[PDB]
Subunit: 250 residues, 4 copies
């Protein structure tokens, strides 16, 4: 039984693949531009992935890996009335590049289900792109498409830490993504049956992608303060979670 | 950091304690004294707990423990229109016997707030009382008493497998409780910040407290398929978060 | 797969089974008695076990558990030329009482093969008994007897920390025991095949046993400063090998 | 504290840095070359390192990591009269390329102390080499030289699995290595203090390195069947060996 595990509490540039604006300053993973004044910049795009690829399904054995991630992220907008665009946890082909700038989160191209990009994402959306987005701020599960397969309402607590837990099991295939805001004592959850064999290639890079506005004044920070991940691929023909969550939060 | 953990996928009496009306047999944890036919009996009080007491907060350093738990439970009633009452993931004192049955869920004596009780539990309510309860079916936390302050909405599933995740964080005192239906997708979550140094004592028996009503018309069951738990007691003024990504994979995944 | 683990970087009473002279003093498991002036006492016997019975083999499936323990102990003798008798990690029946003191270490009655004792022990022996002992300080594997089935040489450093690791890989049926004195850069290792199915019962108590000498001059402390444990019992297949790597970091540091 | 772990009970090319003759064959790491029919080739060298760099020590804080690695290997020589050379678990610089083959195990160049190497290794040596080696088969601790600063005896059994555990306790500076031949009940151990802040860079790649004999007769299989590892680096300011040696090594 193959295992892979890491937990962050402070970040480093060395054990990550950093694309575009993604920078590590003062131990924090800043996926988008943050100037030498403390101001978020619009038009910024960035990607951060773990240096070691992960096997999420095996063809010759037929088994799918069961994984889980947990990260504390902070979105700080000077104007909560004009924010864009958000951040997402993603699984993408090992050396795959970011795509469209802004509301596409540097992950997808269009609203259609296109498995040439082979990208599963869990988005945290703070802007109404409308044609594919629901009314307000939302957590969405993305499958080859920026038009989320399922979405849940999100009371976006600006400038406040957001603690996420995303879990995938092999017997249930239910990709579950939750978010808590301890300062506002709130909690939200998304759950949909996703199958990784059909969508993602055998080996992927896990990590993050975040963007800012296509406008001039649509600015926010998109920081990750900590990150845990663990995966287990069963050999021949459930996983332990409880022990995973504390590993980072606790 | 003092650690304690375990993962049940097949239960045993040898590593479980019983109180009042509990029973452990046949590959699963049937907390209510179930007859051969499958009959829920009213006027009961099931109490299954792990043998080791689990430390919540230290005196010598003054550090709170962060814990996590995951279990797969079912609430089954032959009549859906009359369900009472359900169970609650209890953290009761070791040197304390179960209390009043029914609405009090075998945990408390009175509806009023009293620190003498020393019991925090995550309920999976089914019956409408209202004197200490909200509007309908609810998943909530019980602090020092049976009367809640904030709960969540939850549709009452009948004869459905549900996987539960409950966690506590020392840094923010936040107790987060979730519940997922693999088949129905009906996933719900609740969170609330309550200080446990003021409420709970130092050592508690952790497990499942089950109960029924005072009438045969309102009857239901209490069953657990698999159980997991972890706890972490921080050393010297940490106020940090425990790992959770690796935990849920131990039991559930 | 059923699992059970704990890490005691500091000790407490409520999760242990203390027998005879074993006490928890200021976070330390002081197994044998010490005077209010810091003076070790002769004719002492002490036992401390984990409050949860640990299943090391299943009868209904024929599967054997894989388990691992680590602990740091410290044997502080007023004089090095007169020490006795040592301490041991042992697996014993759930309700087992302390046996003979001294050279028997509270675990055994004789040097002959006593199958009814049902005890596997890893001894850290600081007294040459001759009736069974090798000539110098030694680690031994004890199967239903104080006459060790195998031994190795232990260059014991008086009053210095001993870092111990004991693993049992069920598939190979091999028990391996190692001791490290980090102050002197010394290391020792013992390994021998032991079949748990015919020696030990299904459920066991896991912990410690220690004694001082039977003469007033031959005295020592037998303290355990920290103790971590892990066990993984499979469902139907014989077993899967345990992950030792992440153990110490999460257990011993 | 930051944590990093993995368990390889079955190997893959995707999460390893393969160098020279080392390759994954049927889910096993064959470090030196071996024919389809089983016979190993002479004069070979192989290396395998994990994809993500591991932080052993931190410059500004002074804080040093505690790590533990467990692996099972199999050394099978067609003839016990002519075996060479051996395998080692080593920590090297990030962009480290293989050095001198044969007796130097692909980790060193000369018998003298050279700092430019920045390499800490645990050798398992089956050939009595020249100006460095002790009289019999031996485990060794290699600190910037093929001449081990401390060795212990190792009764090697041809073609029998060897279970290895290596640990580093930061607070005592102690590196401990153990080898067990479970098939014949034998066990071996060595321990020596090593200052890794003097020797190793802040970031190191961990893994293996093995060589076959520089003469045509001196052949052996240099196989690694499983490999588990974990590291723990604190934030400000010991590892549970119980759980590790299992979850990973079982
Ligand atoms: O206000 C900022 C927005 O600008 C829009 O043109 C774009 O569709 C969005 O993705 C967002 O960037
Ligand atoms: O409908 C039965 C009810 O009986 C009441 O006396 C009791 O307080 C309730 O908890 C409920 O069980
Ligand atoms: O001098 C102390 C010794 O006394 C003997 O009677 C006993 O058998 C030894 O184990 C040791 O205790
Ligand atoms: O004959 C085999 C030997 O050949 C030597 O020249 C070499 O130094 C050794 O490493 C060993 O390979
Ligand atoms: N990802 C997840 N978030 C919240 N609760 C869960 N229970 C199981 N998986 C979960
Ligand atoms: N117990 C819990 N269930 C679901 N999501 C969580 N996030 C943090 N704790 C959680
Ligand atoms: N207990 C143990 N000590 C040393 N090396 C080992 N290899 C496997 N188990 C071991
Ligand atoms: N690597 C190791 N091998 C054997 N015993 C140990 N005790 C601590 N570390 C050890
Ligand atoms: Ca959007
Ligand atoms: Ca009620
Ligand atoms: Ca003796
Ligand atoms: Ca050599
Ligand atoms: Mn969206
Ligand atoms: Mn209620
Ligand atoms: Mn002896
Ligand atoms: Mn050598």
């Amino acid at each position: 039984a193959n295992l892979i595990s890491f937990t962050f509490k402070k970040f480093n540039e060395t054990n990550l693949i950093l694309q575009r604006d993604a920078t590590v300053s003062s131990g924090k993973l800043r996926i988008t531009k943050a100037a030498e004044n403390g101001v978020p910049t619009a038009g910024s795009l960035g990607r951060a992935f773990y240096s070691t690829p992960i096997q999420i399904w095996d063809n010759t054995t037929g088994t799918v890996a069961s994984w889980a991630t947990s990260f504390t992220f902070n979105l700080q907008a000077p104007n909560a009335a004009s924010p864009a665009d958000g951040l997402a946890f993603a699984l993408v082909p090992v050396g795959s590049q970011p795509k469209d700038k802004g509301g596409f989160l540097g992950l997808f191209d269009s609203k259609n289900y296109a498995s040439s990009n082979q990208t599963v994402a869990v988005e945290f959306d703070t802007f109404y792109n409308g044609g594919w987005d629901p009314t307000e701020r939302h957590i969405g599960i993305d499958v080859n498409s920026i038009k989320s397969i399922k979405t849940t309402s999100w009371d976006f607590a600006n400038g406040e830490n957001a603690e996420v837990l995303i879990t995938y099991d092999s017997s249930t295939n239910l990709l579950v993504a939750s978010l808590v805001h301890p300062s506002q004592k709130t909690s939200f959850i998304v759950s949909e049956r996703v199958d990784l064999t059909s969508v993602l290639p055998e080996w992927v890079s896990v990590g993050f992608s975040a963007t800012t506005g296509l406008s001039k004044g649509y600015v926010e920070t998109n920081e990750v303060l900590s990150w845990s991940f663990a995966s287990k691929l069963s050999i021949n023909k459930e996983n332990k979670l409880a022990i995973f969550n504390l590993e980072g939060k606790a």
